[PDB]
Amino acid sequence: PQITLWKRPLVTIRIGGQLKEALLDTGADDTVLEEMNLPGKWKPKMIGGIGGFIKVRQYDQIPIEICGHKAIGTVLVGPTPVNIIGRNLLTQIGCTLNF
Amino acid sequence: PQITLWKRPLVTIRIGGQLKEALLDTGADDTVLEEMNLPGKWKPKMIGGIGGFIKVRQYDQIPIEICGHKAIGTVLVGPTPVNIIGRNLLTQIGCTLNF
Numbered sequence: 001p002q003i004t005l006w007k008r009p010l011v012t013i014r015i016g017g018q019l020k021e022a023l024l025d026t027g028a029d030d031t032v033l034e035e036m037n038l039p040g041k042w043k044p045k046m047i048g049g050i051g052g053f054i055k056v057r058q059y060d061q062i063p064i065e066i067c068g069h070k071a072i073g074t075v076l077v078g079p080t081p082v083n084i085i086g087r088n089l090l091t092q093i094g095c096t097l098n099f
Numbered sequence: 100p101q102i103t104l105w106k107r108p109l110v111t112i113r114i115g116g117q118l119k120e121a122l123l124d125t126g127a128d129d130t131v132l133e134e135m136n137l138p139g140k141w142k143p144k145m146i147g148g149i150g151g152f153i154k155v156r157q158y159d160q161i162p163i164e165i166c167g168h169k170a171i172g173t174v175l176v177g178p179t180p181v182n183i184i185g186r187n188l189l190t191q192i193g194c195t196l197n198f
């Protein structure tokens with residue numbers, strides 16, 4: 001698809017068999033989802049943005065289907081204000097900015 | 100142009116005829132610039148990010164050029180670690196996400 005930006009670029013994702021809404025975020029290095037259960041071992045990590053740093057759980061090699069496009073990559077889980085799809089997965093789905 | 104997302108989508112912007120590097124950020128509602136001493140009236144505002152809120156100064160109707168594309172709108176100024184071009188300006192330059 002081509003997505004304009006008059007509204008937040010929210011899309012439906014499927015992860016660990018569950019549907020969620022997530023923001024396509026070119027300003028995010030990493031993909032960060034709200035607290036949830038994922039299978040496998042996680043590593044404690046910290047990430048930062050505006051407002052400072054939070055503690056997250058890093059899950060590696062996690063399949064996510066984003067708007068019908070498959071990705072398998074690193075997914076951080078923690079107290080993010082919104083589900084964020086970052087550049088690590090946006091590149092996997094062939095997403096670019098155009099103007 | 101087309102901008103891939105292998106690295107942060109940083110571009111040159113002009114504000115006050117002065118050049119700066121800024122992130123093209125689809126996850127940002129508003130435009131947030133690092134501390135700078137812009138002339139004119141402003142309003143205090145709080146904006147929320149991954150780790151909490153920061154205090155910003157809201158300036159209205161500020162001309163900005165983004166990659167040689169003219170825009171004019173609201174710019175928030177405050178202690179952000181990176182200059183952020185948000186959707187309020189991205190729409191004005193015809194920027195889309197595409198995959």
Ligand SMILES: CCCCCN(C[C@@H](O)[C@H](Cc1ccccc1)NC(=O)[C@@H](NC(C)=O)C(C)C)S(=O)(=O)c1ccc2ncsc2c1
Binds near residue numbers: 149
């Ligand atoms: C929480 C709501 C959704 C994300 C919003 N952020 C934009 C986001 O792209 C920032 C943009 C950003 C802010 C600060 C440093 C680096 C990028 N990225 C990050 O926080 C990421 N951090 C990094 C390092 O990529 C995380 C998600 C991994 S934001 O920067 O917090 C933001 C920007 C503009 C704006 N206007 C009104 S509220 C508001 C909030």
